[PDB]
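Batch 3, record 17
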Amino acid sequence: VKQLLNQLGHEERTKMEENWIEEGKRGRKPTTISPIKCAYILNEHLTFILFDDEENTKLAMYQFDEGIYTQNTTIIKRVISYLEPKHNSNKADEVIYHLTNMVDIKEKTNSPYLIPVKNGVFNRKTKQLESFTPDYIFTSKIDTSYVRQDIVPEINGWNIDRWIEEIACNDNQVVKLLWQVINDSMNGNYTRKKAIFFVGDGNNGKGTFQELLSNVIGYSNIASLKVNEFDERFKLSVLEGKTAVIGDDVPVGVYVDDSSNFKSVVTGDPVLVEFKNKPLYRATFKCTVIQSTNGMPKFKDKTGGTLRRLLIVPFNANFNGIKENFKIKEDYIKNQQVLEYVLYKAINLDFETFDIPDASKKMLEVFKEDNDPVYGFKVNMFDQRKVPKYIVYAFYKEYCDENGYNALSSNKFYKQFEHENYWKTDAQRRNEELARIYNFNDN
Amino acid sequence: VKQLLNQLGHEERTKMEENWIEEGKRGRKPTTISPIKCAYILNEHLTFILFDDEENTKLAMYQFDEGIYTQNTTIIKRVISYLEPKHNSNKADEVIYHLTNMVDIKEKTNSPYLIPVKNGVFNRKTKQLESFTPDYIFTSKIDTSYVRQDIVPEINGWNIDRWIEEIACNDNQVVKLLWQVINDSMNGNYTRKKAIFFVGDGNNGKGTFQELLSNVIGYSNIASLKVNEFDERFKLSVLEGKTAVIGDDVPVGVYVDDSSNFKSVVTGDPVLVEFKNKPLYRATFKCTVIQSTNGMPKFKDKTGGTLRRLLIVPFNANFNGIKENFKIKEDYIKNQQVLEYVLYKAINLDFETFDIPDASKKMLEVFKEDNDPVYGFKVNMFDQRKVPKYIVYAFYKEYCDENGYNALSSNKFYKQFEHENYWKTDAQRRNEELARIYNFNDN
Ligand SMILES: Nc1ncnc2c1ncn2[C@@H]1O[C@H](COP(=O)(O)OP(=O)(O)NP(=O)(O)O)[C@@H](O)[C@H]1O
Ligand SMILES: Nc1ncnc2c1ncn2[C@@H]1O[C@H](COP(=O)(O)OP(=O)(O)NP(=O)(O)O)[C@@H](O)[C@H]1O
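Prediction for the assembled complex:
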C-alpha cells in the first residue's frame, strides 16, 4: 500500500510540474497535491467507507493487511502521508473531510454467522474460513490465528484439555459448558440470553481461565466491568466495540441494588449508554457476560427474570493444596500453539442453547434459596395446616434461620405465588400458640 | 439531486472561467464557486428552511428521497460537496451560514392528524396516504412502509394476530387495547393522557412486544427511559425527538419518589428539560409511555392523578412453560411483511379514548389498594360503629397485614375524605378495648 501510494504521489507531483512548465513560471511552483486531489486519488486506489449518515461519523478505512475497517485517524493520516508527505494535520483533516463527502455509506456486517479471525472471516453456517474482503465490514477481529488442529499441543508435558478437566474436577458436563462458554465469548452478535458467573473461594483458576479468554480473544476485544458497576455513569461506555465483558473480581455477596442495566445487556435489549461529556444515545450489546466472584452475589430483584438469565460455573477445583504453577498463568496460556487449538476447538463447536450442568442447577437452586427467603422456607418445609395462616407462617421458621428480614402476610401472598394444594380455608384448623419455637412438625 | 448539483456546479465554474477569460489573466484563475454563490444556487434549486428564529437554530434541508427535513450537518455538507467539492469544512460552514441568513422560517407541522410513514404522510382525518412534499415539515418518520394488507402474513406457519391473542390469553379487550396502544405509539403529537405499564411474572413476551414496537416504528424514533429515571438530570433530553418512550425493564416495586415529570409527560403538560452543558428550556412532550416491569411499582403520591394517568396490561401469558421460540424475538418480528401488516392494521384503527379492559380495571384497583393502606383497609372492612373512632380504626386492622406505617388520625381524615354514611357522632357508641386483636367483627 505504501509503495503504491508513493508511486502515485510522485506521478501526480510530476504531472503538476509538467503542466506548470507548459504554462511557465506563473507563480512559485506546484509541489504539493491539493487536499481535494488527494481524496480523488485515495478513493480510487483504496477502500474508504462511512458506517452511517449520523452526524460527526468518523471515516473508516479498509486496511488491506489486517482485513478489517478502522476509524483510527492516525492510521488514516499516516496513509495520507504516503501520498502527500508535505500535508500537515490541518490539511490531512481536509483530505479526510473530502473523503467523508465522497465515500458511500455501508453498514457493518452484524451477521451472527460470521466471526472475524486473524487468518480471515469464519462462516459458522459453512464452518469454513474465508479470506479477507472489503465487502465484509468488520471493525475488530479475534487475535489468534485459525489453523486446523489434529493433536492437542503439549508444552512441558502440559495438556490444555486436561487442564480444563482439572478445572472442572473431571466433570463432563462442566467441560462441555466451558467450551460452549468460549464459543459464545468470541461471537459478538449473538448473546444467547445467558449470564456466566465464576464462583470460586480461592485459587480455583478463575483468573487463569479469564486470562485464557483474554489471550485467545483480542486484548482490546474484551471489556472489564463488574456486575454492580453496570448501572454507574459512563461505565457502559466501555462496551462499545467489545466482543465480551469479563468481571475480573466481584465483591463477595455484593448487593446489586439495580440489575436493570445488567439484565438488559444479558438479554440483549437496547440500553441507554452515555459517553463522558458526550450526548446520550441508544445501542444494543450482544456481548456475553463473564464475572469472577468468591461467592454468589445477592440481587434485589428476587424475580424470575433474574433467575433465568443467570448461569453459574462450579469451579470446585482448588489450586492451593496442589502446588501452584505460575507457569500456567504467566507462560503456558500465552503460548500461540495452545491458543490456536483452543480457538479451533471452540469455534468449531456448534450448539444452540447453553447446556446447563446438573452442578449448576443444584448450585443455582442454592442461590434461589439465598435470594428468596420464602422459597427456602418452601424447600425446608418438610411437613406432611393450610387453613391456619399463623401456623404455616411460623415467622418463616424464625427467619428461616438466616437472619433475613421477612414481611408479615405480604410474603404470604408471595408464598402462594411460588406454590398444587394452593389455599384451603377451614375455621376449625385456623391462635393456639404465639410461636423461639421448637415445634418443627406438629401432629 | 447529485446529478443536478454536479451539472449546476460545472456550469457555474464554466461561466466563471469564461468571465475571467473575458477579463483576461488578471490573477490566478477562479475555479471555486464563492460560498455566497453556492448558497444562492442551493436556495434556488433546493428546499432549505429554518424551524424557528431562536438563537443558534440549525438549518434544515428537505431531502427529496426521504421526504423529511433533516438538520444533520453531514448530509448538508455532502450536498455542498455535490455542488462545490473543493470547499473544506470552514467554507461549507460559511455556505450553511449564508443559507441560514437567506431561507425563510417555517414551523414543524405538529398536526396530530398527520403521521409520517416511509411511503408517505398518512392523514387520519381522511385515512389516506399522501406523497411526500416540502409543504409538510417533518423531522422523522415511521420506518415501516404503509401498504394495503388483505391477508395476515404467515412465516413458518406463525400468525401475528394469533401471537397477539396468545399474549393476551385470548382476551378480546386486551388485544383491542394492545392495538390501540400501538396506534397511540405511532402518533407522536397526540398523547391521550394515559400511561401504559407492562407487568409480567416471567417470560410473558413483554420484551418481544417492545421489540415489535421498536421494529414497526423507527429505531431512532423510540426513547429508552424508565419511570424512576424520568427525574434524573439530563434524562429528559432524549425525549425531545422521540415518538414514544419505552422502559425496557423496571425494578420490581421500585419506589418512585418524585413522579412530577413523569405525570407531566403522561398528561402532556410542558416540562423543563436540560441537555448536558446546555441551557435549560421548556418543551412539551406528546410521546406515549410504555414500560416493562416484573410487578407494579409504588408511587408516593397516593393521589387521584397518578391513578387516572396509569393504565396496566395484564400479560398473564407465560412462555416459560411452553417451549420458548427464539425465532419470535430474533427473526419473526423483524419480517417486513409482518411489520407492514401491523403498521396498516394499527394506523387504520380509529379510537378516541383507551378502551380499558376489565382485567386492567381489577389490576388497577389492586395497585390502588397496594399504594394506599387506608384504601385497602376500607375495602377489607366488610363490616355492617362510626361514632367510635378507635373501634373503626382498629390500628387499621393492625396494619392490614401489609406492614405499612399508618398515621394515628391523619389517615383517618384521609379515609373520611375518600368515603355515603360519612361520619356520625354518638357518645354512647364512642375505650372498651385497647386492641394483637382477633375481633374481626363486633356485634
Ligand atoms: N492446573 C494448575 N495447577 C496448579 N496451579 C495452577 C493450575 N492452573 C493455574 N494454577 C495457578 O493457580 C493460580 C490461579 O490464580 P487465580 O485464578 O487468579 O485464583 P483465583 O482467586 O481463583 N482468581 P481471582 O479471584 O481473580 O484471584 C495461579 O497462580 C496459577 O498459576
Ligand atoms: N408465542 C411465543 N411462544 C413461545 N415463545 C415465545 C413466544 N413469543 C415470544 N417467545 C419467546 O419468549 C421470550 C420473550 O422474552 P421477554 O419478552 O424479554 O421476557 P420478559 O421477561 O417478559 N421481558 P423482560 O422482563 O424485558 O426480560 C423470547 O425468548 C421469545 O423468543
